[PDB]
Design a protein around this ligand. Sequence first.
Ligand SMILES: Cc1cc2nc3c(=O)[nH]c(=O)nc-3n(C[C@H](O)[C@H](O)[C@H](O)COP(=O)(O)OP(=O)(O)OC[C@H]3O[C@@H](n4cnc5c(N)ncnc54)[C@H](O)[C@@H]3O)c2cc1C
Lengths: 662, 134, 7
Amino acid sequence: SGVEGAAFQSRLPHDRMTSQEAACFPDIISGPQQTQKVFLFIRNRTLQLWLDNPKIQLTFEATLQQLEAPYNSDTVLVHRVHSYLERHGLINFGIYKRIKPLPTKKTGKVIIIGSGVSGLAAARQLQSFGMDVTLLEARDRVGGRVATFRKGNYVADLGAMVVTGLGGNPMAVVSKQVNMELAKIKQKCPLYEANGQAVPKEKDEMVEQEFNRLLEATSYLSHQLDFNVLNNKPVSLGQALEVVIQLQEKHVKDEQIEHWKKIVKTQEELKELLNKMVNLKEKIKELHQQYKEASEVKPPRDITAEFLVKSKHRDLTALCKEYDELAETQGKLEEKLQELEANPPSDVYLSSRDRQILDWHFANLEFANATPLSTLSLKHWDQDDDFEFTGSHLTVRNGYSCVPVALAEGLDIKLNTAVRQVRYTASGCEVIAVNTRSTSQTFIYKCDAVLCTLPLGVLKQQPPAVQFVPPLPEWKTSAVQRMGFGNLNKVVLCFDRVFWDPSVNLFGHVGSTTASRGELFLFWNLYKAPILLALVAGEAAGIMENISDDVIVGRCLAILKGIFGSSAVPQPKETVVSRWRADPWARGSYSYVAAGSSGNDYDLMAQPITPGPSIPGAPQPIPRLFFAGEHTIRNYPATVHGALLSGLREAGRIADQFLGAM
Amino acid sequence: KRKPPKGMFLSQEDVEAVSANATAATTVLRQLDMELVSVKRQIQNIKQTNSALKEKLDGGIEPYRLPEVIQKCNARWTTEEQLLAVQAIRKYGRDFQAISDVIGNKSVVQVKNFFVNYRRRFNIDEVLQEWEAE
Amino acid sequence: ARXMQEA
Ligand SMILES: Cc1cc2nc3c(=O)[nH]c(=O)nc-3n(C[C@H](O)[C@H](O)[C@H](O)COP(=O)(O)OP(=O)(O)OC[C@H]3O[C@@H](n4cnc5c(N)ncnc54)[C@H](O)[C@@H]3O)c2cc1C
């Protein structure tokens, strides 16, 4: 609450100093706990002021004027703290109104490759530190993977679409500045099977609950039994889920076999008793005949004949008592048996109606991670799960493009300029680009630094789209190999009227096979106008890229009619299909932690490259080639906020380097 | 969590065994399926072996049971009951419970009293040696 | 379902 809220909303602990701060304020962190708590209030209070209104540049003069002693006291420390938050982009980022118009005495020159959000965030920061910044993008528009489709009042995002909570999200600040309209998302999502009828409710829950367990089970499998390598090869979340399901199937059988083997041991005991009772009956039979024969010797008989009746009479009432007690412990075993033959264990682990609803839960996972589960690291797929924001996820009714468009305002963005070669040396860098329209036309940009927001997809392509001169060193390229670049596609269906449940944000279709859990597995409304997004995920995303839009929209209306009626669902006015893996300025959707990657590759991807020296025996040059992007930020990968933070970061790194540290 | 979620079973042993080969998964699962069969077989077998043995037992022993007489045991033996006893001692040995039942009107203790009073005159000694032979 | 795994 208050000073502490601002720390948390700035992704920082109010309690204690970060590593970034230890680096810049070693005097303090190594010094007494008293001076640390001062530092910490100034930092938190300075942040609070920024956030409390982030449409106005917050100056040094301003912050000092709204501290009060004892913190107010040391006006150097306050100016250091203010200038630290300024670089590292914790305050005065996004769209502020500058109070002092930045001077035209621009110092140092930087080429930024790509009008990413990462690109634009950095561009704006470097500009506000008074550097000379030019952005070079291949596309005919800014935004990159923040692509929004307009056509009349119809507006739908084919790229980033969701603000994944405002609780510590830097986009929380950008939304106040840009006045983009955020609508909430009710995550409740009814399923509907292939046949087109809502999975009933008690099913929905049995399967979800079982999904949620099966995951937790891979986590136990990973951390507890250390099942993370198998035949010299890293285990996938996929492999682990199969090995868990195969074992839950194997326990169902072990369980039946244990139960029938227990019935059989009872029947083999009832048998040992019947064999005994049948030998006593046929022996009693014999003895009774002997008693009647002896009993029928009419008296007056002597005493041995009298003893013979009296004896046999006993010997029989004895064997009759044995067989009465064997026949009671018979009637116990026939109940023990009507008990067991009435209380079986479970027949199956999952039916095929079940194993298919489970497959829709695996598509939702394949959709979120933008890749088949066969590719996700078992040890590391959920590494960023610590830094997830707070509050409900939100769509942008407005269309997310409204952000990068607003970030672009005031930058030297050269559009339709495909970078082809980045050359970096002791004395500086040349970027060589071409006009994407007429490609013979060649452009040369000279600069002190190159900032590369090139997507991991592009960085991966062979033969390469962009050549580095000299080559990126193994440690960098190896990381680009190890790291995963995924895929996820949307289908935009604009109708004339709403024929779905307006108070339901999303709903799912369950495919008939595992092999296509992903094919049009889920449907959103923007709900503003009558639009339905349909997501393609998993192995499916990749394959549906070679299938005409008419066919995809066919499979779509097919499904929708299944669920809502035939005369209910009209033809769409307008349809679009994303084909991200095909798009050569993307080569896919966003990063993922592949098996045999870690989070540590995200860190390699951010470390800048320092050229060798030009004259042998010459001071160690400065770093020249820097990297930002969704794929460079360990704790917030594959997002917009992660991009935006990665840019804010490389801006600091480059100013620290070329304008000397604050 | 040292414990897997509740209901899910994941032994170190079991995991190694469903991953020591590509198909070792669904050979382990067949060689159980092909044994859930081979029990269910030997159930029906013994169910039928057992229901045969029940129709071989279809009268109880009701036509063979002897109605019983209450027997208010006496002090005086009688020469009759003395002779029944010596013959029962020859037949049953020390089963004082049987020797009582045979005679009819003597508690198990009176049978011991006898066993020691007439030990002399009925050579009960000589008699139990003859019983031990059998 | 609930709509989880979109952390
Ligand atoms: C379908 C989809 C849905 C998503 N949904 C969400 C979501 O809901 N929420 C969320 O937070 N994130 C989401 N993301 C992720 C988010 O969109 C991106 O991670 C973010 O925009 C990253 O920006 P960036 O700066 O790293 O790269 P980009 O935005 O891709 O920018 C890189 C730039 O490089 C340019 N370029 C490429 N090659 C060259 C070249 N040779 N020369 C010059 N320019 C070149 C491209 O044109 C582009 O402008 C989604 C991504 C996709 C694909």
